[PDB]
Amino acid sequence: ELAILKEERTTTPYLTKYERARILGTRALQISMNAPVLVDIEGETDPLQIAMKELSQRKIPLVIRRYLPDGSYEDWGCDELIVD
């Protein structure tokens, strides 16, 4: 109906900072609610530093749904998008 295949993807393949902000907030909220961490834990035990330790390595199980302004949307995985 709306959705586009993952090959016509003409939006920018970067994370930008607003996207980055929401990913950090939501991943940190999950790991605050006892979602176990994929990366090592040295001294970074506060959840925001845990989230930046993940995004440093690009280890994030989320999906951006950019609503393109028709209404359709490009399901970008985190794994493919280039971390700034």
Binding site: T10, T12, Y14, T16, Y18, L68, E74
Partner: protein
């Protein structure tokens, strides 16, 4: 007035309805903080200055590269196979000079706010790679030409492959590619700055990455930042100027107080 304007993931500018306002954000796609005023060097000066700085000549010996700076200098003089490259590129820059002279920046004031400032990267590579010496280099002219020409098709602002995409791509970064070829032409690099190969490849990769990192971000609520950042000098500010002139320009009057003409006369 503006409180919804959001730059979306197509580089356009819509309200809540979808009244598109600018097809490309700020006519360039570039984030508003990320500029400096630089000097597009191929605007000012005479034809003598341009033809002395840039015009390569591979038949006459002395107007070519003075051979102290390059290693391969035995392998050069006379070859029309490379002369036609350089004549095409000199005509390229005459096209750019006519372009930036007669279309865009007509009165020739060359200082303009334009993104990522390359000169700083050049001298950063220079101080990194110890670039005195006054030494032969192994970096060839065809690698310069193909580096510039293979640069000017890697500055994707508007990505995708439809016809208006490629057209809007070339409409987008014409001035920025004009800047790069206004600086990194062959006689300027291989005389006035004296790079090597490895410095030049690092220059190419870094101009790539930072003109990628100064694209505008999507969702920058540019109307709101715009409205505040025009209201802010309105805080601290015979024709009417200042706050009532700003008020009349906004609240648009049919009766402003003292209108005016700018009437040129003809040249004779």
């Amino acid at each position: 007035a503006l409180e919804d304007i959001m730059v979306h993931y197509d580089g356009t500018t819509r309200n809540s309805l979808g009244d598109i306002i600018q097809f490309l954000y700020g006519e360039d796609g570039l984030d508003g903080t990320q500029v400096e005023r630089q000097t597009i060097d191929t605007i000012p000066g005479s034809d003598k200055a341009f033809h002395k700085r840039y015009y390569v000549d591979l038949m006459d010996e002395k107007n070519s590269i003075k051979p102290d700076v390059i290693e391969y200098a035995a392998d050069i003089l006379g070859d029309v196979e490379l002369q036609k490259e350089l004549n095409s590129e000199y005509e390229q820059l005459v096209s750019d000079r006519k372009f930036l002279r007669e279309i865009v920046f007509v009165n020739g004031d060359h200082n303009w706010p334009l993104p990522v400032n390359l000169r700083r990267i050049i001298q950063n590579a220079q101080q990194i790679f110890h670039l005195d010496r006054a030494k032969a280099s192994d970096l060839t002219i065809p690698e310069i030409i193909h580096g510039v020409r293979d640069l000017c098709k890697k500055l994707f602002v508007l990505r995708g492959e439809n016809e208006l995409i490629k057209e809007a791509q070339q409409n987008a970064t014409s001035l920025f590619q004009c800047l790069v070829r206004a600086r990194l032409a062959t006689r300027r690099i291989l005389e006035e700055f004296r790079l090597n190969r490895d410095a030049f490849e690092w220059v190419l990769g870094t101009i790539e990455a930072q003109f990628q990192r100064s694209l505008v971000h999507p969702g920058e609520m540019v109307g709101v930042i715009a409205a505040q950042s025009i209201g802010e000098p309105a805080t601290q500010m015979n024709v009417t100027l200042g706050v009532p002139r700003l008020k009349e320009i906004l609240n648009v009057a049919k009766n402003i107080k003292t209108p005016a003409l700018t009437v040129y006369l003809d040249r004779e």
